Design a protein around this ligand. Sequence first.
Ligand code: DOL
Ligand code: MG
Ligand code: MG
Ligand code: MG
Ligand code: MG
Ligand code: MG
Ligand code: MG
Ligand code: MG
Ligand code: MG
Ligand code: MG
Ligand code: MG
Ligand code: MG
Ligand code: MG
Ligand code: MG
Ligand code: MG
Ligand code: MG
Ligand code: MG
Ligand code: MG
Ligand code: MG
Ligand code: MG
Ligand code: MG
Ligand code: MG
Ligand code: MG
Ligand code: MG
Ligand code: MG
Ligand code: MG
Lengths: 50, 7, 71, 76, 64
Amino acid sequence: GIREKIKLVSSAGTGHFYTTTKNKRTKPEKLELKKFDPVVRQHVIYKEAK
Amino acid sequence: XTXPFXX
Amino acid sequence: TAEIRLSDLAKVEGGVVDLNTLKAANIIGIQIEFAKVILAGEVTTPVTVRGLRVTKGARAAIEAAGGKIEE
Amino acid sequence: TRNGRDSEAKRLGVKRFGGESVLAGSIIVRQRGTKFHAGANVGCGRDHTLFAKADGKVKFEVKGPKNRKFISIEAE
Amino acid sequence: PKIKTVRGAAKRFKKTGKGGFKHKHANLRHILTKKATKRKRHLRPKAMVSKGDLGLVIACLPYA
RNA sequence: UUUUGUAUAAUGGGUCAGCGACUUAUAUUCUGUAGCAAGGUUAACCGAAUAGGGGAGCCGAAGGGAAACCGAGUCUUAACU
RNA sequence: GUUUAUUAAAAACACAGCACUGUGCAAACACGAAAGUGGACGUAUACGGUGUGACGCCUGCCCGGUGCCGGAAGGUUAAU
RNA sequence: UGAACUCGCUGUGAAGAUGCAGUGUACCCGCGGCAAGACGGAAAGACCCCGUGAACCUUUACUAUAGCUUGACACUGAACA
RNA sequence: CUUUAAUGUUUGAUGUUCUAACGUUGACCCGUAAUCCGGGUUGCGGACAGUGUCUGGUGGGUAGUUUGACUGGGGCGGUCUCCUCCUAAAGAGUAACGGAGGAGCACGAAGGUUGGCUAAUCCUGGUCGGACAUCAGGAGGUUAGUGCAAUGGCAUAAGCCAGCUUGACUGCGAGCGUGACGGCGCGAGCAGGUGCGAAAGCAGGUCAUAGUGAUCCGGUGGUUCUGAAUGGAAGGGCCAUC
Ligand SMILES: CCN(CC)CCS(=O)(=O)[C@@H]1CCN2C(=O)c3coc(n3)CC(=O)C[C@H](O)/C=C(C)/C=C/CNC(=O)/C=C/[C@@H](C)[C@@H](C(C)C)OC(=O)[C@@H]12
Ligand SMILES: [Mg+2]
Ligand SMILES: [Mg+2]
Ligand SMILES: [Mg+2]
Ligand SMILES: [Mg+2]
Ligand SMILES: [Mg+2]
Ligand SMILES: [Mg+2]
Ligand SMILES: [Mg+2]
Ligand SMILES: [Mg+2]
Ligand SMILES: [Mg+2]
Ligand SMILES: [Mg+2]
Ligand SMILES: [Mg+2]
Ligand SMILES: [Mg+2]
Ligand SMILES: [Mg+2]
Ligand SMILES: [Mg+2]
Ligand SMILES: [Mg+2]
Ligand SMILES: [Mg+2]
Ligand SMILES: [Mg+2]
Ligand SMILES: [Mg+2]
Ligand SMILES: [Mg+2]
Ligand SMILES: [Mg+2]
Ligand SMILES: [Mg+2]
Ligand SMILES: [Mg+2]
Ligand SMILES: [Mg+2]
Ligand SMILES: [Mg+2]
Ligand SMILES: [Mg+2]
């Protein structure tokens, strides 16, 4: 079904992560977003995008 | 069991 | 692990509440290694509690009854 | 091409009629479009559910040059 | 002979203060990514067994 | 008897007599009843043997939490209006 | 010739004949956890299995599939 | 073989009536005969469907397995290229 | 390195013999007036064969089972979850092998917000240029558009474009809808922390309604909550996820 599951991991120490999908087959660039990290309790940067 | 009663 | 009532403790005979004593007075269980005293029931005679975790309540209750709580 | 299908009914409709006294947050209508629009003290959720925002009595109105149905919540 | 406990029930239901049963929600085990954060959040806390199910639960736990 | 429905041309019985189908054990809950009551009761055993002894135990007077643990509170959450 | 003893005697089974194929004998094969025994006191002009069914005139084309037979270099591949 | 004081017709009716309604007919009881009816007797329908029934039988259904076959180790040693 | 070639090391390996384990369903001797068996002698084989344990393959020979349900009998065909409309009798709901269709995805922008914008169709004119391409005007007034089926919505746009962006936030949640249940949906508001806006304010994904799979078992990360003498550890729990 093409679209593929990926995790966004917290740029902070905290091993926290969010979880989503993407069309690797067209948007191969890793995915970087600002998301709230509830361990540091601060909007930090999230990375990786499988 | 063999058609007519009782052949 | 067991819990003890203020209502007990005035019934160990030998105003000193500790594991083997409660046990003797048949209120906890021969194999209990740990016991707490809860704020349940009233406490009347003063009494001494040795080696037993004690809730805030129970402490007030016991201390008001002129008793001591020596961990 | 072979029929036979249909989908579970969605229990859409009016949940509280005019005059009904509701507590805040209470759904007044499950609708699909906005047959009714949120008026005073009435909210509009995603599916276009209209809900109450204050405790009061469900009022139905027709307001405006478009003549649109509105649901509001007056204090009792 | 003692009634025997449906041992799988005893791994899923716990009897509480007023005599009811708490139990874990269903749907937080996997296939998580698509489920709304809201949805999952209200599934975390435990819940009471329904009126219509106490018959069944209780049948499975004589010694609860 | 079974059926939506049987005088039914649907089932069973030739007739009489005797016999023939919801029990028993242990658990468990509930009702009723008796006892004692924040207590209630003892098992095996002992025995002066339906007595008496035996409180080992079990249930109940505390819950909340997965748990550590805290406790008339506890969990949830950094915290809860 | 045989057969459904008791609803089928037949065109069914057997049959001499034919063809394949297995078998070097402690045979193949078969009854047996085994010992032992049939095959056979036989030995490839023998013994087993399979099909076809006197005889006459004959029995063509196909080996992709499925079975079987042969192969050894690669590939894949068990316990160890 | 439930019990019978056991007729026809047309209707009706769990829908093919000696027994229901209407009506017709018929004095009581045998014997010899016939088989149109008593959905006549016999046998809890073999067809058909159903039961998360049974059994055999088949196969490139599943799962196992005797047998057959492969190697490793053991019984299993020695001396030479 | 493109690919070969000359000793090794041992190690098996294919190999050569030996005999002494082992086979002999050759001959002989004795127990024996015995085609068994045992011992002995010899001949022939020989570490092979064969057997035990482990192991791949084969294995209807045997065995145990499976081989769905709905259905105007059954079978064939078709159907089995979900979404939309009608049947549905102006609240909800409502059957048929009734009538018609669609889903099992997509999007990091096609999400958020601030600002801005407004179709379809027809006529007239206009290079290539045509019934229809792009341009201008008038009519028109949403008949357009909305990732997609239908329905209901949509101009204050939910339609269209740009900038800045990650609220497609984490913890919760008064109070409701809908379910036999499992569960599913709506939700203001609160706390932390965000983006857009001068501000009021908006944002907990997408106009809404399909786009889905319980539980067990297991994987990954986090987290000392647990830790069977003690300290650790395994394993378990808890949270995220597959
Ligand atoms: C050509 C004439 N035939 C056709 C097959 C008439 C019937 S038959 O004799 O051949 C045979 C027995 C009854 N059958 C019916 O079909 C049947 C149909 O309706 C009825 N029976 C109604 C009745 O007659 C019920 C009666 O009370 C009961 C009976 C007579 C059943 C007896 C049992 N016989 C069988 O089961 C035989 C079954 C096989 C032979 C089937 C074949 C189709 C396979 O035949 C019948 O059932 C046959
Ligand atoms: Mg005791
Ligand atoms: Mg989990
Ligand atoms: Mg009937
Ligand atoms: Mg009647
Ligand atoms: Mg009758
Ligand atoms: Mg009659
Ligand atoms: Mg009878
Ligand atoms: Mg015969
Ligand atoms: Mg004959
Ligand atoms: Mg031959
Ligand atoms: Mg023939
Ligand atoms: Mg009649
Ligand atoms: Mg008549
Ligand atoms: Mg007569
Ligand atoms: Mg029958
Ligand atoms: Mg039968
Ligand atoms: Mg079989
Ligand atoms: Mg069926
Ligand atoms: Mg309606
Ligand atoms: Mg209606
Ligand atoms: Mg859009
Ligand atoms: Mg705007
Ligand atoms: Mg033109
Ligand atoms: Mg240990
Ligand atoms: Mg230890």
